[PDB]
Fold:
Amino acid sequence: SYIDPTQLPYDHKWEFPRNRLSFGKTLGAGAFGKVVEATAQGLIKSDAAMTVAVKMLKPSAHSTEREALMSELKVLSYLGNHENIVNLLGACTHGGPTLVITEYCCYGDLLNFLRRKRDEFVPYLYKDFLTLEHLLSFSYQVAKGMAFLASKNCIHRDLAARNILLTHGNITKICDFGLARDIKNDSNYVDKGNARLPVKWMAPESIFNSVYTFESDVWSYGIFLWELFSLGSSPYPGMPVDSKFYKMIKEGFRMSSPEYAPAEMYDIMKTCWDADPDKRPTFKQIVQDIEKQISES
Ligand SMILES: COCCOc1cc(F)c2c(Nc3ccc(NC(=O)Cn4cc(C(C)C)nn4)cc3)ncnc2c1
Ligand SMILES: [Cl-]
Ligand SMILES: [Cl-]
Structure:
């Protein structure tokens, strides 16, 4: 962390009346928070309703979780809108609990989308089959969103396919479910000290020294590329997170290329996984690299 989210300002232009929201089904829930599908009336200039996503806390939440939701709102307001990120539509900070209104993404999280599309995947129609072209586009859009986050001095800390949403026209949006994810029952989060952490996506310096940087997010992006080109497989298959796992990461063990990864995409993964953070590429360098790969395709 380079910037203190609590000190970031919230623009009151985002303020929306909560009585103009109609809550539907829960899209995701954790121990202290949830994301609900909702209908927002008067969000559009004309008298028309629109589907939105609303993040809110559960009655189970404490002062820490209340501050974390406000900190998330300040970060979203500070960042402003970007094509490759879930965008803020509004918020409710008066007359009740904090509500954060973000855009609805019709295809949901990228991880479940890849798992659902896995069997009909075509490397190279009405069928809407997942292709290598879509995977390259997804890699490019996420690198672009990450380059923008880096440019605003923001560290994601939990970049993974599960924190990517898919919307209209195979458009990816970096998100953070955070408290609206049941990390206690998610096998992708491991007990490490007093926390439940996504260890298989974390850079060694994050694991062993609690250091989160622009470079540690780059490491996670490399893990994300592995998930993407394996069509939603869990990283380090058959390897539990134990003493042997930590020893192997420290001693230089790295995953082999996934079945559908082009050699140039696996080259990015290897550089993302450099033990030296200074030897890893920046998100901007990754964007330029993928750009070249797409044009040459
Ligand atoms: C087949 O699928 C059917 C549709 O299913 C869904 C499921 C969902 F969970 C959805 C969803 N959830 C959601 C996830 C995260 C957040 N909040 C943030 O990301 C806030 N944020 C953003 C950041 C950084 C800038 C990256 N940090 N915090 C808000 C909402 N949203 C929209 N549409 C969804 C659609
Ligand atoms: Cl509850
Ligand atoms: Cl609250």
